[PDB]
């Protein structure tokens, strides 16, 4: 038993949060190209037999509410859980359309003690977002 | 037997801690581009950490930024796999 049991009736949910347009007052730019990402992910995880749900342009409040609600579903018949976040970010932070969300706040909903129907099951968070402002100059080989 | 409440999470970050992450306005982000391609090619073949390692290599090797701004030109990216998983993960049973 060195591998996760992945033959439950369902592979599980794939939640894709695609934030493209941000409230003007935040001063955050539109993330051109992100719809290409969201579409690619939808197809890719569809072919892996995940129940994909795409959500676009969520406020910070909507992100937290969505995550809370999803973590309170019954995942007993699901092998795993996947969440993809596409947004602006900083270290430890993802942006809703109107301001930031702590990544810890989101993932805490799925803690082994807080989401019992996912205890012992792989919980995957895939994050396309900045983690700061450093640039990698690279090295020729 | 208890398990840690933080066990069995995997965080697939597009970029290293402290760094920008790159997105192309036409093609999509370097990371998601690469992730989908490697999942399509290897999900029926490789364990998930090994798939993500192929993603690391693809982003690291095949992408480099182009900018009229010298500050942002010719830059590279490495994704960052963060695993608190306790077992191997195969998408096929």
């Amino acid at each position: 038993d060195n591998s996760y049991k992945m033959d439950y009736p369902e592979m599980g949910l794939c939640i894709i949060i695609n934030n493209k347009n941000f409230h003007k007052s935040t001063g955050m730019t539109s993330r051109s190209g992100t719809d290409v990402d969201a579409a690619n992910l939808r197809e890719t995880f569809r072919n892996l037999k995940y129940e994909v749900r795409n959500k676009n342009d969520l406020t910070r409040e909507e992100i937290v509410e969505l995550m809370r609600d999803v973590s309170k579903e019954d995942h007993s018949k699901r092998s795993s859980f996947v969440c993809v976040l596409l947004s602006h970010g900083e270290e430890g932070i993802i942006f809703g359309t109107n301001g930031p969300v702590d990544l810890k706040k989101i993932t805490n909903f799925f803690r082994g003690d807080r989401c019992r129907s996912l205890t012992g099951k792989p919980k995957l968070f895939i994050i396309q977002a900045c983690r700061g402002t450093e640039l990698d100059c690279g090295i020729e080989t | 037997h208890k398990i840690p409440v933080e066990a069995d999470f995997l965080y697939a970050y597009s970029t290293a801690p402290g760094y920008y992450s790159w997105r192309n306005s036409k093609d999509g982000s370097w990371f998601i581009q690469s992730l989908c391609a490697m999942l399509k090619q290897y999900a029926d073949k490789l364990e998930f950490m090994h798939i993500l390692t192929r993603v690391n290599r693809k982003v690291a090797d095949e992408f480099e930024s182009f900018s009229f701004d010298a500050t942002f030109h010719a830059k590279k990216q490495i994704p960052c796999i963060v695993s608190m998983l306790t077992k191997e993960l195969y998408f096929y049973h």
Partner: peptide, 4 residues
């Protein structure tokens, strides 16, 4: 190319 843009950054996030």
């Amino acid at each position: 190319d843009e950054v996030d």
